[PDB]
Amino acid sequence: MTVPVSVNYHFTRQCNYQCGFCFHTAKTSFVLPIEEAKKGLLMLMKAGMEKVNFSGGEPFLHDRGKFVGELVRYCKQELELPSVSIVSNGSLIRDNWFNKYGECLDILAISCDSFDEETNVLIGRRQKGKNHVEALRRVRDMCQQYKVAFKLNTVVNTYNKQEDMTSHIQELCPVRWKVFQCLVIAGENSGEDALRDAEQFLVSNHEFDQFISRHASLECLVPESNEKMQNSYLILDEYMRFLDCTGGSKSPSKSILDVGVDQAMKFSGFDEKMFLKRGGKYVWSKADM
Numbered sequence: 468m469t470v471p472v473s474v475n476y477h478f479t480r481q482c483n484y485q486c487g488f489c490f491h492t493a494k495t496s497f498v499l500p501i502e503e504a505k506k507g508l509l510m511l512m513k514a515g516m517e518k519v520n521f522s523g524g525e526p527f528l529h530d531r532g533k534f535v536g537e538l539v540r541y542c543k544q545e546l547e548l549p550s551v552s553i554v555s556n557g558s559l560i561r562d563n564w565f566n567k568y569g570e571c572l573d574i575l576a577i578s579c580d581s582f583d584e585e586t587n588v589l590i591g592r593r594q595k596g597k598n599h600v601e602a603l604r605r606v607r608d609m610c611q612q613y614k615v616a617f618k619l620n621t622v623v624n625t626y627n628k629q630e631d632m633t634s635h636i637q638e639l640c641p642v643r644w645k646v647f648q649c650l651v652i653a654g655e656n657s658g659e660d661a662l663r664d665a666e667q668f669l670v671s672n673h674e675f676d677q678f679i680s681r682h683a684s685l686e687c688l689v690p691e692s693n694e695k696m697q698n699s700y701l702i703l704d705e706y707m708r709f710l711d712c713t714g715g716s717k718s719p720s721k722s723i724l725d726v727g728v729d730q731a732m733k734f735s736g737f738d739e740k741m742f743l744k745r746g747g748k749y750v751w752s753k754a755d756m
């Protein structure tokens with residue numbers, strides 16, 4: 468039986484940005500009552516979960532960041548999880564949140580696809596109406612101030628495929644720099660009713676390889692081609708259903724809240740060998756960094 472050692476919980480699909488290739492789109496606004504989410508996290512820890520990553524959607528948009536804060540505190544203080552992380556666009560992370568919850572967060576990943584603001588506009592890394600300026604640098608400084616490990620995520624796509632990020636990554640010094648090839652998921656960023664159309668963003672495997680090669684000097688680089696990314700995550704949706712990506716979509720299992728972890732896991736599509744090959748198990752607790 469596969470142990471769900473590291474699990475992503477996309478607890479909301481709502482987002483304030485509009486990234487054109489987004490593969491986890493705003494198809495619903497449902498969020499579990501926080502006590503139900505805590506019951507799911509408890510049974511995941513009982514099944515062997517050691518790392519949880521909160522995703523979405525934008526995790527800091529829900530309830531002004533209080534929901535993700537409380538889940539981080541619950542997992543660290545009540546479940547004693549070795550690793551608690553978040554992946555965020557960074558735009559809504561505030562100093563008061565960090566002062567309250569940062570001691571419980573091991574790793575904060577901020578997504579940054581370009582250091583060129585025209586490219587970010589083309590991609591949709593922007594809110595409609597008002598906008599923020601240097602959210603990335605301000606969040607990076609908060610991670611140093613509150614002693615959280617800083618991680619950066621980048622999607623290689625048509626509009627950054629020639630970008631040399633070396634000097635910027637050198638300055639930011641992330642502990643881990645994930646570099647994803649833009650990935651198509653039917654019903655998310657392809658398909659008749661999809662909210663996004665990734666076609667204009669996709670790169671060839673070779674263009675992905677050339678972006679990786681350009682940045683091979685950076686020791687923090689963790690590349691994930693489509694092969695390494697598609698099925699190598701345990702992905703719980705906003706109903707705490709595992710999503711199986713093996714068929715090219717995000718096909719949900721029943722909720723662990725109804726059937727338990729082991730039963731739902733059979734329908735996760737998780738490729739544990741690929742999880743290990745891409746570097747999914749790593750030094751992820753802050754005592755060890």
Ligand SMILES: Nc1ccn([C@@H]2O[C@H](COP(=O)(O)OP(=O)(O)OP(=O)(O)O)[C@@H](O)[C@H]2O)c(=O)n1
Pocket residue numbers: 473474475490491518520522523552553554576620643645696697698699700701702712746747
């Ligand atoms: N087919 C896939 C593959 C991945 N993801 C999501 O893409 C994000 C990738 O972010 P990453 O930083 O790689 O997630 P972590 O699990 O925090 O990564 P790691 O533990 O390896 O640092 C995750 O939310 C994951 O669930 C997705 O929606 N669909």
Ligand SMILES: C[S@@+](CC[C@H](N)C(=O)[O-])C[C@H]1O[C@@H](n2cnc3c(N)ncnc32)[C@H](O)[C@@H]1O
Pocket residue numbers: 482488489490491522523524525526554555556577578620621622647648649650651656665
């Ligand atoms: C859907 S996002 C959710 C968290 C937050 N909204 C953010 O963007 O960081 C999770 C991660 O997946 C990446 N991502 C989104 N769409 C992708 C795609 N089509 N292919 C590869 N990665 C993608 C994001 O950039 C981000 O690092």
Ligand code: SF4
Pocket residue numbers: 482483484485486489490491492523524525556578
């Ligand atoms: S990838 Fe962009 S649009 Fe998709 S959830 Fe993250 S910030 Fe929102």
Ligand code: NA
Pocket residue numbers: 492493494654655656660661662663
């Ligand atoms: Na969609």
